[PDB]
């Protein structure tokens, strides 16, 4: 059934770049939607047991990033329905 | 004509009759309340 | 609502013209209901643009 498992990475630029340059200031991210996450993973990446439930820019930009990323890669498989 | 035949069925007669005996007891317990004698 | 220099009716008629441009594409018969449907859609798009241009940003 999975006839065309061609590419995945086209969704990534398809989801980061559509949310990076829109800032939309007064929310959690005063910067863009993805810069407020990729900036907020390198503080925690080098073996940090922190990041509690009050850690807004990590935990919130986990779900609000992956819920569009999942949908846009699923629609990337819908991007092999016209084949 | 047939309306009285509907009013002669089992539940309708049972409500026009148990409504009546229930009215006998309720009206006979406002007029004579607390009747433990007789 | 002021005249021809840039205001709210300036940015409604362009949404209605691109709305009736959609009606030329979405079952593009030249009947009445292209106008009554599609000018209504560009009217929805127009109202969604106008206050959205009014809330976050200068009009």
């Amino acid at each position: 059934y999975p006839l065309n498992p061609a590419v995945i990475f086209i969704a990534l630029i398809g989801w980061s770049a559509v949310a990076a340059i829109p800032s939309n200031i007064p929310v959690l991210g005063g910067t863009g939607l993805t810069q407020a996450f990729l900036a907020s993973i390198q503080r925690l990446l080098a073996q940090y047991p922190t990041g509690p439930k009050l850690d807004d820019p990590f935990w919130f930009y986990l779900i609000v990033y992956h819920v569009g990323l999942f949908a846009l890669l699923i629609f990337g498989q819908i991007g092999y329905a016209g084949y | 004509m047939n309306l009285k035949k509907y009013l002669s069925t089992a539940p309708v007669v049972a409500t026009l009759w148990l409504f009546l005996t229930a009215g006998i007891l309720i009206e006979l317990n406002r007029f004579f309340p607390d009747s433990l004698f007789y | 609502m002021i005249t021809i220099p840039y205001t709210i009716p300036t940015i409604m008629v362009i949404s209605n013209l691109v709305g009736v441009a959609v009606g030329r594409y979405a079952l593009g018969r030249s009947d009445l209901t292209q106008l009554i449907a599609s000018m209504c859609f560009g009217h929805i798009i127009g109202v969604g643009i106008v206050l959205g241009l009014s809330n976050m940003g200068v009009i």
């Binding site: 059934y1 959690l28 | 309306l3 | -």
Partner: protein
Amino acid sequence: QVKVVVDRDVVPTSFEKWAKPGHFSRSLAKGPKTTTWIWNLHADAHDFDSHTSSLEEVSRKIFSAHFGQLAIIFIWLSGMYFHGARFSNYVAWLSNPTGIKPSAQVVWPIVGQQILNADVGGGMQGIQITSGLFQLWRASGIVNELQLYVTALGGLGMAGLMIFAGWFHYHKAAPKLEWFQNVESMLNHHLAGLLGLGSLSWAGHQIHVSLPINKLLDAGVAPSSIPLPHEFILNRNLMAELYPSFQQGLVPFFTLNWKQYSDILTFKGGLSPVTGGLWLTDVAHHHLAIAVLFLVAGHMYRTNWGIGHSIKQILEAHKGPLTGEGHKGLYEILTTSWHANLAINLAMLGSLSIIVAHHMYAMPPYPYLATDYPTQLSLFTHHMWIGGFCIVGAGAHAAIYMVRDYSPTVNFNNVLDRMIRHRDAIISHLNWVCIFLGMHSFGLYIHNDTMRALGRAQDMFSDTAIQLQPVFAQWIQQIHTLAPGNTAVNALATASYAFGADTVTVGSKIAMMPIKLGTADFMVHHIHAFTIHVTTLILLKGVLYARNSRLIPDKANLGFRFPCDGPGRGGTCQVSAWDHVFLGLFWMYNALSIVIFHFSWKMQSDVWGTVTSNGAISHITGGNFAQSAITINGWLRDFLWAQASQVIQSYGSSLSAYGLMFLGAHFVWAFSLMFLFSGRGYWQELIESIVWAHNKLKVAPAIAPRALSITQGRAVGVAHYLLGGIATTWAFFLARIIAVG
């Protein structure tokens, strides 16, 4: 295409067929040679899809019966407005709502029962309302008794329009099937006309009645200096003082200067701390959002003008590869059978009613609703139970569609029967999820039960013991704390005070407190996940095995309400698709009994109660949940034993009717069990051994006295299990919280 084709003068309106009971079914007009004709007179009285296969005559019957239902609903609501008018203390309640307990029904003075007339203040006694009608009326803006008499009068008038309506639509103008299968128009008028104009016109009522009136009552004006709702529309000068945006008229509406309507309409959320309810500015703005959004939503169905969809060209385009055929067939499924539509509409109606229950405890939408806790309680509880039963009707009427109106020709390789091709893999993983959740939702209670009983309280699942803090609920609850500044940008307060900031105290009574969810509430949520998955197991087993099981490979031939097949296959008692609905009603009583027992005890420990000075806190049970919900001795002691003290000591007082509806509802509960455990092969010749005692005295009844049938004899066991078991919790709840709230 779309047109209206209606037969006129269809059925004569004589009383002739009332004299033939059981006229309707050709299998039943034989006359009663047994008493089972009596009961089958009633179970076949609404098998409209089993009188005659002609869908036109069926569809006329049902669509005319709907107006009978709405006739009873308008008689009922006119009853509520008249009992609010004549009998209630509503005008007195409107003076001080936090002191006067709401009551309408004033019990007639016969022997003793005048003690049920509770002295609820207002200079007049009577049994206390817990339905919360007065909070709906203060939100409506009903000032004096005259609008209740007039609205009850209009309730009778609409009841007459529904009686004359259904009479007019079965007999002397009844439509064809081509009128009924016009479903793009039916959605096109319900999404827009019913719901759209309902919410829009209700926004008109709230803005031009409720906003000025519940601004004047929010100022605290007695209902004498308040003018008529009427008198706000004759001149804007009585509303321009209250909201200065009425002075500009509709000119800022049509110029799209909707910033100017910030006085009338806003997005605040939270709760008004004076009245304890929602801001009616938010509620009127809300119904405008449903108004524009539903009126937009109506126009997606092409009817006459070639503009819109049909359902067919939508469903056929979802031809996904894991289903193969896609939804090819469902528009012929859902426009020929009514039980399928009843399954969908009952499922979504019941789940909407549960959504109603949650959104009424945590965002109390009526003024002074969360300050009289019984109306706060039971309006949660009641919309749960119709929120429950209407789901099982889904599991009934999705079963009936699979038995009666299923057709494999129209329904070949689509999304529907490709489920039935792997219904073993459906029911088997529901089976696994039920056992996994049962161990991990109830074995935790046996565990903490034993660990508290074995003394080793360190080995429990308490706060102090092995903690099971619900991570996700606390996290997204914290997102809702961080709503009104971050993401709901134009908000001011949170979506509720069940999420975020400090509590709302209205008249020394706690409106809503931020509910903390820790390590006991976790396990009760896994109860709810568990007992939802069991009813989903029984009601998907009752639909997927409705027609051709691998045990009995002809249930479509046997029917829907067949009892069984026999002692063969080692016994196949209780095997029909009806019987899974029979079991889903018990598990309905379980699942909702622990939904409301989770409610009425976590919100007597973590929300409700009173406050004293310096912001001090005092719940009704006093924080006695998280140390006590983790066991079952803590559950049964601290809730079902300790909360009984205001039900059981209620004799001599005004709550004593509940003390009668507590005992007797135990009775009916246990009286159900006689119908559940025994069977008609006992009762039939017990009865016939009594028929000997009538034949001896020539008191032989002509209608021969059978016992009940099997499906009846179990259906009555459900219908007493639920009336008895539900009315126990009914009288226990209302007898509990009236003695406090």
